[PDB]
Design a protein around this ligand. Structure first.
Ligand code: BCL
Ligand code: BCL
Ligand code: BCL
Ligand code: BCL
Ligand code: BCL
Ligand code: BCL
Ligand code: BCL
Ligand code: BCL
Ligand code: BCL
Ligand code: SF4
Ligand code: SF4
Lengths: 94, 95, 362, 358, 358
């Protein structure tokens, strides 16, 4: 959409994964928090369908290694279920 | 204290405005070159063992790439201290 | 000196068709610098209504509707798509499905509905002494069977809570009307002239389906009117199944904010002009429910008015008895602006229901 | 702009009398909130003392209107008496005609008014009570001759509806108050109970069958309803020693409204205690009911109120102030009076009180 | 013209505190919609922490008014505690005096608030919910000493009415909400259920017989009702670590209205997520209720909202814009703020939101 709606830095609404707790299911606790940080969402296949098209991007915050199905190259190729590969940001202070 | 700040590596451009506000007794912000500084090869970083959570780095609203985040004390991640309300738009023509 | 300015810029157009046809194109623009009475701002919305003739033998038509809105940093979407037919002239049948999504949550549904409209009287003197009846009291009865697949945890939670509430309390049938019409809507119900009866639940079931359990509910309710309700008094006008020989559309959108309101409307559909007896035709009588409902938000800021109404007729048609007067006749077009038309516009933008009638002939 | 030109006059009588003459003119350039225009109407209200021993008085009323090329007429004529101070008896007849259709009727009615309390502290601490909650009960027996085909059709349809459905008693209120009237019912402060039908009969008469119906209903108020809170003021059977009249007419159109009113009747001025008298407290139902149509166009205000007193009477504590005293007359115009007029022409119920003495 | 002069101030506190000082002045030259004028009133509300272990707090309230040459006084004083997060307990007493009549009472009450749903999606997709439908249940046991003749008369009349009529339970709502209040009940969004009487007794006491009554009623809302939708916000038992006050007074007349308000209490600012705080969402019941008297005279508007923040706090996303920043203060006047003030003084509920951070 227009540059003046939301944040001007990003081309679409950005999300981050913040929680990775294991509750009898491994990775039920995917907590999609938006850039503005007022909600705590989940995979929620509606979120997945709006991800796959053009509108959602998610990142992993180097601060669920296999339970989120890392595949095999460049130390990062995180995929959620089968379709889209959530890119990740790095924050290495060392 | 709480609410660390965590410069993002991949988005930083090295403008250094984040480094100015940090008090001189606290040199928590530094530089990393690893290459030629014209195609983006001098991105900065934050030392977590010296930072004292001033918020001068986040509350100043200076980062142009959204590289400062200020993660909240519990789990929440910010990117800028306030975001416009994301409306959506069209064109009009008074006939 | 005097009070607030708050100009209200609006632009209207009607375009008709000749012969015995009743189709029409409608266009509308609007602008105000007044804060909307929404306790959450900003708020934006787009609406698409489309309809096409499924088949004329049965009388079945197919109608779709899509709603998107952004209400204070929250995306809402509602899709519905259905098939409707008049089984009699006072019974109507519908089979459809849709979904609703808010933020991340979303769920689909499929409904199966019938509606019956009844008038309180049928006296023919009312039909031979009054040429243009307006108020007509009656009552509508809705019978609905809807199925929703239960796949989310929250859907199952809502289902179990509803079953427990329906089992336990004896006043569910009438207290449900409190949750039903959320906020100011409820108040309008009294004033807008309507009366909703207590719902009657015929059984809540759950059955295994394609992917899992599905909650099936069927229920009946009724609502009566003193004549102001269009869905009752004008049951025949609002579903013109005859003239839908080609697809029709309605397509609108408003965008509100902390400093005024923006409006944009297109449309093309039959039923715009109706026979008025003696060879003359007329624009349809203006619906009253939208006027009185909008009158509950249009009294908060005194405003200045400027508008065009621009009506385009086919070949050989003339407007006679236009009240208030028009201003110009560009040989096929008639334009209304300022004066008594402006007064009438200010009157109807506050809930007034005064009649502005147009008769045209050939 | 929409100026609103209005002209008022009150004329009183001296001594212990309470009679008064009322005159009113009005003009607006605003479209009436009528979904059928134009609309015209005249009203005649006459009353004469039938006889004072019984307390019986005779009252007539005639209505003609032309509503969008349709002539409507309603005549009613009746005899009323106060059997007690909280029961009233009435015997009357009339007819209604629309276009070509017409039919007569004869009614036989009683009304009982009851207040929810009678505490005398409310009577010794408040000098001018306003709100007074209560309930009215109407018992009606009306006979209508069935001679037209349409009358017989209505009768048979009504009998079938009353027999078949179990929710006739409460759904009849939907047909009863047609259109916006129903809405006012909630806001104007009233509550209509479900009617109770005591039997629909048909009996042979002079020219043919006659439908006889008798039914009862009740309506309560929170105090705003004048017919309940002021049951004693609205039927002054004492001072009707000569015929009285009320005679009005409005004539609406697509561009403003015309009004014309004459009247002469008792009850205009009442005792206020301590030797002072006052104009009667303004009724509230007309104000709040007209407030539902008076908010559609902002308007400019100009008016006269011109009050003429008898010999030796003086106005003291007139709020807002008057402007002139032409040695017997008092005139109100502009300023706070204009503000109050604009206030009450939109549904406001602020008090404009006049006290006069001698 | 009818200018409306008003003056507002909010003063906040820093840290995690939520306390605040509120100050307000107001003036209009319009006649109040009171069928009795003049009318004056003062209100004192005080509250102090009885003890934090139990959560019990003590709250007092005093009302004096002069309504058309009649002094009215109402004193109430009570102890309140949250027994659960959806049940509340109260023990209190008071008195009411009108003119010369006066009587005391002691009540014993519990209130239960229930929401119609608890869906957590509504909690993760909407950041700032506004409308929330629910229902409240009140259980009251009140004792009044019968010492006056009029008290005994009221008691006997009430016993007779409760015994005799079968429609007391629903007709009591007519006497309950006197006058226009009843009408607001429909529009303001509320629904009062029929009361249910659990027994009227009379027992000997210190000086004589005492009438004891206990009764239950409920009222539901579509979300507009604050007492239901915001059950948690209106009784901040946590931050009451020092006495708080609310102290207001209006003084009406036949030519405009005067207002004067002081206050200091917690709950003025609430967390808004992401480190930002906000002024609490404006209550809706006062706005829509005052909108029923604010449409009678078109008026001119001038006002000045002046918000004072603590050290290091900044306002961001103030809609509409402010006009000045005197290094700690923010001032709103004219323009869109004036339009919003005129909007909300007529019943509008548009949102004027302020977010501040540090
Ligand atoms: C609004 C006043 C009455 C109402 C009046 C009607 C009327 C009248 C009808 C129904 C009908 C239906 N109603 Mg209902 N109904 C109401 C409240 C409800 C509620 C509820 C929870 O409150 C429910 C669940 C229903 C359910 C239903 C289904 C049983 C049925 C088909 C709906 C439809 O096709 O969807 C499709 C949804 C829409 C298209 C949304 C758009 C609605 C607006 C009003 C359309 C505006 C038309 C626009 C001005 C011009 C459009 C022209 C374009 C060219 C198409 N009604 C209210 C109380 N209802 C229909 C029926 O008979 O089914 C047998 C029907 O004709
Ligand atoms: C005609 C109305 C649409 C509908 C439209 C919406 C809308 C709009 C919303 C939801 C939302 C939700 N829906 Mg749904 N929802 C419907 C059918 C269902 C059914 C079911 C068994 O049929 C279930 C379990 C649910 C479940 C859920 C709730 C758990 C969830 C958030 C709470 C909320 O407010 O709910 C609202 C509950 C309903 C409107 C009716 C639920 C029906 C109950 C459970 C079964 C029928 C009981 C009774 C016989 C019918 C009474 C008539 C209705 C009161 C009008 N919906 C029907 C098909 N639903 C919210 C959401 O999507 O994201 C938060 C929301 O905003
Ligand atoms: C179908 C539309 C609404 C609904 C309409 C009602 C109505 C109407 C009532 C209840 C009632 C109740 N509902 Mg329910 N209720 C719904 C969804 C829920 C949900 C949920 C997680 O979704 C929950 C926890 C509840 C829980 C409850 C309790 C607060 C209460 C009765 C509990 C009992 O008797 O024991 N409802 C759906 C969303 N519910 C009853 C109550 O007491 O309300 C105060 C009541 O009258
Ligand atoms: C309007 C508020 C209440 C109402 C309040 C009263 C009051 C009060 C009374 C009645 C009385 C009567 N009502 Mg009732 N009544 C109402 C609704 C109804 C309805 C109905 C279908 O709605 C019906 C059929 C009736 C029927 C009746 C008859 C039983 C009876 C005599 C009527 C009369 O004399 O006619 C004559 C008709 C008129 C004169 C029409 C003019 C009416 C207006 C209101 C008069 C304005 C007076 C004017 C301001 C000043 C006039 C002074 C002139 C000098 C005369 N009422 C509404 C609900 N009804 C009367 C009674 O007690 O009988 C025992 C009585 O005193
Ligand atoms: C107090 C009201 C007046 C009255 C005033 C009017 C008015 C005004 C009109 C008619 C009109 C008509 N009248 Mg009539 N009418 C009355 C008594 C009757 C009776 C009867 C057995 O008593 C009958 C059969 C009729 C028949 C007819 C209808 C067939 C006809 C056009 C339909 C209409 O709207 O009717 C309206 C029906 C009524 C107002 C009540 C009919 C009473 C029913 C049939 C018997 C009582 C049933 C129930 C116990 C009473 C309920 C209380 C009323 C709802 C208030 N009237 C009473 C005396 N009548 C119309 C006309 O003249 O030309 C079109 C019209 O505009
Ligand atoms: C007395 C005032 C009104 C009246 C008030 C009512 C009311 C009130 C009701 C009916 C009801 C009905 N009336 Mg009826 N009804 C009247 C005159 C008529 C006339 C006529 C030619 O005059 C007709 C055809 C009808 C016909 C009907 C049916 C539509 C319906 C019940 C039919 C049945 O049970 O089987 N009424 C008079 C004019 N009628 C019932 C209904 O279903 O309405 C939808 C109902 O509740
Ligand atoms: C107004 C909307 C609801 C209402 C909502 C509530 C709410 C909400 C509560 C009660 C509670 C009570 N209600 Mg209740 N209640 C209503 C109508 C009634 C009626 C009646 C005849 O109509 C009665 C007898 C009662 C009786 C009672 C008692 C059972 C109980 C304690 C009263 C109290 O402490 O007194 C003290 C009286 C006052 C202090 C008068 C001042 C009231 C105004 C509204 C306070 C404004 C607060 C102001 C904005 C800020 C104050 C801050 C200062 C620092 C203190 N309610 C109406 C229908 N009721 C309380 C309870 O739970 O008890 C267990 C409670 O929390
Ligand atoms: C919660 C309301 C306060 C109350 C507040 C007022 C106010 C305010 C006034 C009076 C006034 C009076 N009070 Mg008290 N009064 C209360 C309790 C009582 C009781 C009792 C046995 O409890 C009695 C006999 C009385 C007696 C009296 C009346 C005789 C007297 C003037 C008439 C009036 O309007 O009364 C009003 C009657 C009441 C408000 C309720 C009376 C309760 C009845 C008798 C017993 C309860 C019956 C029923 C179960 C409760 C229904 C709920 C209420 C309708 C809300 N009060 C309760 C404690 N009372 C008037 C006065 O002081 O000087 C003129 C007045 O203005
Ligand atoms: C508790 C609040 C109100 C109250 C509320 C009601 C209500 C509500 C009703 C009555 C009812 C009645 N009340 Mg009581 N009533 C009260 C105080 C009084 C007083 C008095 C001197 O204080 C008196 C004389 C009355 C007298 C009466 C009669 C007018 C009537 C029933 C009498 C009967 O059946 O035989 N009430 C208190 C002040 N009373 C019934 C009635 O008929 O009202 C018309 C009714 O429905
Ligand atoms: S928060 Fe303070 S100590 Fe930490 S990096 Fe920013 S300025 Fe330096
Ligand atoms: S201001 Fe932002 S882009 Fe510039 S050095 Fe700091 S973190 Fe990097």
């Amino acid at each position: 959409s227009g540059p003046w709606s939301g944040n001007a830095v990003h081309k679409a609404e950005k999300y981050f994964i913040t929680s990775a707790k294991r509750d009898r299911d491994g990775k039920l606790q995917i907590e999609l928090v938006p850039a503005s940080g007022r909600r705590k969402l989940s995979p929620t296949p509606e979120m997945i369908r709006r991800l796959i098209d053009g509108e959602i991007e998610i990142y992993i915050l180097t601060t669920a290694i296999d339970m989120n199905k890392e595949i095999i190259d460049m130390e990062n190729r995180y995929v959620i279920d089968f379709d889209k590969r959530g890119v990740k940001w790095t924050m290495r202070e060392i | 204290a709480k609410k660390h700040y965590f410069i993002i590596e991949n988005l930083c451009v090295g403008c250094g405005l984040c480094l100015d506000k940090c008090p001189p007794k606290v040199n928590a912000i530094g530089y990393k070159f690893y290459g030629d500084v014209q195609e983006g090869g001098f991105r900065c970083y934050i030392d977590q063992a010296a930072c004292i959570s001033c918020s001068a780095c986040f509350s100043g609203d200076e980062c142009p790439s959204g590289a400062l985040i200020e993660v909240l004390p519990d789990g929440e991640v910010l990117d800028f201290s306030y975001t416009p309300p994301e409306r959506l738009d069209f064109d009009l023509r008074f006939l | 000196g005097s009070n607030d300015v708050t100009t209200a810029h609006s632009d209207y157009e009607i375009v008709l068709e000749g012969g015995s046809s009743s189709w029409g194109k409608v266009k509308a623009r609007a602008k105000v610098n007044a804060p909307p009475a929404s306790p959450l701002l900003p708020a934006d919305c787009d609406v698409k209504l489309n309809v096409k003739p499924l088949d004329p033998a049965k009388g079945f038509v197919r109608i779709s509707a899509v709603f998107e809105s952004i209400v204070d940093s929250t995306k809402n979407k509602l899709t519905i798509e259905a098939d409707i037919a008049n089984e009699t002239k006072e019974r109507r049948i519908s089979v459809g499905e849709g979904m609703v999504s808010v933020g991340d949550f979303s769920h689909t549904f499929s409904f199966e509905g019938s509606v019956v409209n009844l008038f309180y009287y049928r006296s023919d003197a009312v039909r031979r002494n009054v040429p243009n009846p307006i108020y007509m009291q009656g009552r509508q009865f809705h019978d609905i069977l809807m199925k929703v697949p239960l796949d989310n945890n929250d859907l199952i939670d809502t289902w179990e809570g509803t079953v427990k509430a329906i089992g336990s309390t004896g006043a569910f049938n009438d207290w449900i009307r409190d949750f039903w019409f959320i906020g100011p809507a409820f108040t309008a119900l009294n004033e807008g002239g309507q009366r909703i009866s207590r719902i009657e639940v015929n059984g809540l079931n759950t059955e295994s389906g394609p992917k899992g359990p599905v909650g099936v509910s069927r229920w009946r309710f009724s609502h009566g009117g003193s004549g102001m309700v269009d869905s009752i008094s004008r049951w025949a006008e609002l579903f013109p199944s005859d003239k839908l020989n080609r697809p029709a559309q309605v397509e609108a959108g408003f965008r509100s904010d902390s400093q005024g309101i923006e409006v944009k409307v297109d449309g093309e559909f039959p039923g715009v002009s109706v026979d008025a007896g003696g060879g003359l035709r007329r624009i349809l009588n203006h619906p009253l429910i939208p006027l009185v409902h909008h009158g509950m938000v249009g009294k908060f800021n005194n405003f200045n008015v400027d508008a065009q109404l621009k009506v385009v007729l086919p070949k050989g048609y003339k407007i006679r008895y236009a009240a208030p007067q028009y201003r110009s006749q560009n040989l096929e077009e008639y334009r209304w602006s300022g004066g008594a038309y402006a007064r009438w516009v200010e009157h109807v933008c506050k809930g007034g229901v005064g009649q502005f009638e147009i008769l045209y002939a050939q």
